[PDB]
Design a protein around this nucleic acid. Structure first.
Lengths: 220, 150, 138
RNA sequence: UAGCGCCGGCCAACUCCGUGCCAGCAGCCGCGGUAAUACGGAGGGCGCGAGCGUUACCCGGAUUCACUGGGCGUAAAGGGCGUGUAGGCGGCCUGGGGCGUCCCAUGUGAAAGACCACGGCUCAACCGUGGGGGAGCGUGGGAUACGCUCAGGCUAGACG
RNA sequence: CCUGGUCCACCCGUGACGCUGAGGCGCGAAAGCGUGGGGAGCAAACCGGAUCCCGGGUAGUCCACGCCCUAAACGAUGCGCGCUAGGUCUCUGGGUCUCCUGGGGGCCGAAGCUAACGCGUUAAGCGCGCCGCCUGGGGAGUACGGCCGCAAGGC
RNA sequence: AGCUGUACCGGAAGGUGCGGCUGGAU
């Protein structure tokens, strides 16, 4: 401990929002809010970190998924400080189970960007330029960062398992391990390697992601 | 590498403005006669396409069967929807005593000695699903031992 | 009025194991203790303990599960798939030695209340006695 | 000496002519108004054969009286609602009886029939010899977990 | 004024005194009957008016006794007991009082169940006890026999 | 809208009393 407490890790949600399956992680209730037991936080953190370091040294890739508001930037920055892909803008329904069809769109993206890196755009009058451009910004808005995946990942990292329930389900279906920064209002059983902490509290997300990414770096 | 059996093709219709649009659904089993079974239901506008899709689903959906002496380790009763399947082990030299659908499923599993019965609803799709589920739910002496004592 | 205690106990075990509870409580009695020891021996449960709840004697039963499953629905494989009551009040089922059932080709067990105490089907066939058929478990 | 039924699906086995909702077929679904693999003949084919079919009755399929083994929100089926007699069912601990229950032994479960072994008819059917098994019931012992009865106690049901 | 049911707090008292219950015995909306009274309004039948309406109107609707005893008499869900996540609203008690703990009435929903719709601690889930009922539709709640009723009719 | 239990129809593709239900829309 001693790093988490100042980062606001152990602050959950109100008595209303809690998923009962999470009852084994709540220390106590204070001022109408649920507090997460820090001991088990540390223990599960150790377990997940051991997994991550072994996987990283083995050469596995982790797809970082934070599609909340305040999670976007942290996901982006932490992913950049690695070779790992990321999805932060929007999770398209079926990135994994339908990976084949998404790959076509990825190829279209790269070929279009090559077209703009070609002197052939002097054809296709300004209207055609406009259309293909609009397409390119749309693509780079969505399919950037997901680009690196030549194939299926070896793990997944989720900010809020309930917010990204679809991605969690997709990971489950394809027998891919699940890592998430779950909180009070999330189902423990769907997440293989769990970090019981905060999904709000930008400080907590920053700390967890930074530590994990640094561990990846030192183990690469 | 695998064998296919085509249980049924059906032509299901839907209304549109002054017309009927048809679609073909095919029920297909894929097996190796060694204890790997797949069941696939495939929908397509054309029969061969339905067959292809059903085969694909069957391949991407595999189940392992714990065969001893080409028979089941222990009897099972499974309900799916309104239909029930009853499977019961039999001594060698009995043969597969089953309806068309269960026989088709079980033959490709390597099963050669079994006594079966269908109860309640006898919809081929549901019977097939129930059969597959029952097969998914078989345990051996070793598995039980590991679960209990280990 | 609680008509049948033994059925109640079996149902409590079943209901607990369905929601993957770690422990369950059942009102204590001698005969229930016998059934529980039989279950513990055959490794269906982690084991039972004699406890007290607000003055009343209870049995605390600790349940057993398999490893965490992979893929969708990671709920662990059950150790007690199925538990019935054979001879209910209102229809008592007694069996001789020759009529003792074989459950799941022996993978499961059947609990009997013989004159020599509470035995599994195997032990009852070995000794060579019959009695009231209590329950089947697998 | 070689019949006899069948060839739309169930169900093994397909073509040509003749009539063209007529003659007719059909166990159910249903066939027949220009080929109709379903009606009637012919070639071929399928099944069984000194037999092949059709009616009548019984069991099966029928889990469609469900003990094994079903149900009652809307498919058929919760009584309009109470109070209650006969009946059915019944918490925890200790002890006696041994009715139910279980076990051992013994008697009876005739002959023929069913089952197994061997044998006689040139084989079989048929038959002979031997061996078994058998629900139930009588008798004499043993067991006491559960159900039952008594005898005592307890407070978690129920009353005050 | 007389009287029934029920909830909570103390945990004081008895010591299994319990649950269901075929017959029986009671209660049973509206409509309908008998013997008396009453009748403001509303209104079957009926009398008129224009082409499903508008004017009048007896029974009845009312009371007191005695009948009748049926419905979409419905939550289309028999009664009792034990077990299985919670969230929210609302009524009524207790406390140490916006936090607990009882008992009712609704909505969403774990597991589970269901043919689906949906139910889901007020189960249609998991179990035990007792009762009533079901077995293709129409003929038909018909005929016939029997028991009730003044009759309609009911079973 | 529809359905239903009783009661009555000498203008009965049915109508109206009295009451109930949603297996019908604000």
């Amino acid at each position: 401990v001693k790093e988490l407490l100042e980062a606001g890790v152990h602050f959950g949600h109100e008595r209303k929002r809690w998923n009962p399956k999470f009852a084994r992680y709540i220390y106590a209730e204070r001022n109408g809010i649920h507090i997460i037991d820090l001991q088990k936080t540390m223990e599960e953190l150790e377990r997940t970190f051991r997994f991550i370091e072994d996987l990283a040294m083995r050469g596995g890739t982790i797809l970082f998924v934070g599609t909340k508001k305040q999670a976007q930037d942290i996901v982006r920055m932490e992913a950049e400080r690695a070779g790992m892909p990321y999805v932060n803008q929007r999770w398209l329904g079926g990135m994994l189970t339908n990976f084949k069809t998404i790959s076509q769109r990825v190829h279209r993206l790269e070929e279009l960007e090559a077209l703009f890196a070609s002197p052939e755009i002097e054809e296709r009058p300004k209207k055609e330029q406009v259309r293909l451009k609009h397409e390119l910004e749309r693509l780079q808005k969505y399919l950037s960062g997901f680009r690196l995946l030549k194939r299926l990942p070896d793990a997944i990292f989720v900010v809020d398992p309930t917010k990204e329930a679809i991605a969690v389900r997709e990971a489950r279906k394809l027998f891919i391990p699940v890592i998430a920064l779950a909180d009070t209002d999330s189902d423990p059983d769907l997440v293989d390697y769990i970090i019981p902490g905060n999904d709000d509290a930008i400080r907590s997300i920053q700390l967890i992601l930074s530590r994990a990414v640094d561990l990846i770096i030192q183990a690469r | 590498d695998f064998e296919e059996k085509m249980i049924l093709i059906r032509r299901t219709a839907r209304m549109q403005a002054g017309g009927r649009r048809f679609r073909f659904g095919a029920l297909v089993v894929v097996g190796d006669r060694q204890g790997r079974v797949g069941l696939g239901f495939g929908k397509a506008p054309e029969v061969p396409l339905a067959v292809q899709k059903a085969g694909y689903y069957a391949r991407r959906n595999m189940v392992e069967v714990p065969l001893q002496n080409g028979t089941i380790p222990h009897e099972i009763e499974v309900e799916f929807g309104a239909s029930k399947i009853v499977l019961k082990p039999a001594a060698p030299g009995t043969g597969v005593i089953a309806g068309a659908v269960p026989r088709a499923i079980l033959e490709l599993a390597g099963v050669t000695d079994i006594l079966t019965k269908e109860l309640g609803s006898r919809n081929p799709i549901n019977i097939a699903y129930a059969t597959m589920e029952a097969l998914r739910q078989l345990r051996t002496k070793a598995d039980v031992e590991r679960l209990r004592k280990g | 009025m609680l008509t049948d205690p033994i059925a109640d106990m079996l149902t409590r075990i079943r209901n607990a194991t369905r929601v993957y509870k770690e422990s369950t409580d059942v009102p204590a009695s001698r005969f229930k203790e016998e059934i529980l020891r039989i279950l513990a021996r055959e490794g269906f449960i982690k084991g039972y303990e004699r406890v007290d709840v607000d003055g009343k004697p209870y049995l605390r039963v600790y349940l057993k599960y398999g490893p965490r499953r992979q893929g969708p629905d990671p709920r662990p494989e059950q150790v007690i798939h199925h538990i019935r009551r054979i001879s209910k009040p209102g229809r008592r089922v007694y069996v001789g030695v020759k009529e003792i059932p074989r459950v799941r080709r022996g993978l499961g067990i059947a609990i009997l209340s013989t004159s020599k105490g509470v035995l599994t089907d195997r032990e009852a066939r070995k000794l060579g006695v019959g009695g009231e058929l209590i329950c089947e478990v697998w």
